[PDB]
Each structure stands twice: as C-alpha cells, then as structure tokens.
Design a protein around this ligand. Structure first.
Ligand SMILES: O=C(C[C@@H](NC(=O)OCc1ccccc1)c1ccccc1)Nc1nnc(S)s1
Ligand SMILES: [Ca+2]
Ligand SMILES: [Ca+2]
Ligand SMILES: [Ca+2]
Ligand SMILES: [Zn+2]
Ligand SMILES: [Zn+2]
Ligand SMILES: [Zn+2]
Length: 165
C-alpha cells in the first residue's frame, strides 16, 4: 500500500458527507446506495463513522461536474480521468468529484459508480495507489474488479489500519 506524503489523515473519527448534486445517468436512489455502500466498505475496517448532512459544508463533499469546476483540475470529457479526490484536511481536502461526461451505471460492464466511489474514498481517507494488483487502490481496479466477488484486499486493509489502528 502507499499513503500520501507527509501522511495526511483525519484528526477525528466521526466524519460527515454530503452529496451535492446528482448525475442524469441514474436514479437518485441508485446514487445514494452506491455512495453509502462505498463508505460502509471503509467504515467496517476502521474506527471511523460517517453521517450524512443535507446542508452545510460536510467534511466529504461529493459532487458531479464536467470540464472546469472550481479547482485546478478540469474534467477531461468522455474517458480518461473518471474522478478525483483530495487527501484528508479542511476545505476541499477530503472532497470527491465525479466526471459527469462519464456514463455512470450500476453495472459489471461500464463505469461502475459503486466501485469508483469506493476507490475515491480510499483517497479521501489518506491512501494513495498500490502496487498489489488485487487491491481496490491499484490504479486499474476499475477494469480488473469483479463486482460479484467484491472484497477489500489485505493490502487495502493493512494500509488503512496503518493510519487508523
Ligand atoms: O492523487 C490525488 C491527490 C489530489 N490532491 C490532493 O489530495 O492534494 C492534497 C494533498 C496533497 C499532498 C498531501 C496532502 C494533501 C489530486 C486531486 C486532483 C488532481 C490531482 C491530484 N487524488 C486522486 N484522486 N483520484 C485519483 S485516481 S488520484
Ligand atoms: Ca472537505
Ligand atoms: Ca473523463
Ligand atoms: Ca454522465
Ligand atoms: Zn469530535
Ligand atoms: Zn475536481
Ligand atoms: Zn486512484
């Protein structure tokens, strides 16, 4: 596993999240559950707890955007960059942006929202990319991951535990 440099991490165990806007691609129920399933994956192997907010600035702000969106890292249209997230911290740190030029499905085939979200949240937690090919955090997880058999790898686990005990 790898972490970000200087090892940023959350300094509290109770974190909030807010889903700002929705993707045309799916029903809202479907996005709520993708996200919620993704946070729970992580919540099961760390002493952290996530609670949803409907207003205010939540620690982890989740939104859908295209091209330029208020940070230095413009989306790039269909394909390539799918999403981006920031290491733990205040303001924009911990936030996750999803490329709405992508076609978000609940499928085994296509860009799966649950899987991308699960990977992006590892970054919001303080994990960087892994060399282990079976890891959720390896860069090509999006293509090699068989959703039927979905589980955190031991690498994933050893990494988040080295941060949160
Ligand atoms: O690779 C990162 C880092 C992110 N930038 C960040 O977290 O800077 C804060 C920071 C920096 C250093 C130490 C502590 C905090 C970023 C965001 C946008 C573009 C490039 C990088 N994000 C990823 N999201 N999805 C991935 S796949 S990679
Ligand atoms: Ca934030
Ligand atoms: Ca893209
Ligand atoms: Ca879309
Ligand atoms: Zn507290
Ligand atoms: Zn962004
Ligand atoms: Zn990544």
């Amino acid at each position: 596993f790898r972490t970000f440099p200087g090892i940023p991490k959350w300094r509290k165990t109770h974190l909030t999240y807010r889903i700002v806007n929705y993707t045309p691609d799916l029903p809202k129920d479907a996005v709520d559950s993708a996200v919620e399933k993704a946070l729970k994956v992580w919540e099961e192997v760390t002493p952290l707890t996530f609670s949803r907010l409907y207003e205010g600035e939540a620690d982890i702000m989740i939104s859908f955007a295209v091209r330029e969106h208020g940070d230095f890292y413009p989306f790039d249209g269909p394909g390539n960059v799918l999403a981006h997230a920031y290491a733990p911290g205040p303001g924009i740190n911990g936030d996750a942006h999803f490329d709405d030029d992508e076609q978000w499905t609940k499928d085994t085939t296509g860009t799966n929202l649950f899987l991308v979200a699960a990977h992006e949240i590892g970054h919001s937690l303080g994990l960087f990319h892994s060399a282990n090919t079976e890891a959720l955090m390896y860069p090509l997880y999006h293509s090699l991951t068989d959703l039927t058999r979905f589980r955190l790898s031991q690498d994933d686990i050893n990494g988040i535990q080295s941060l949160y005990g």
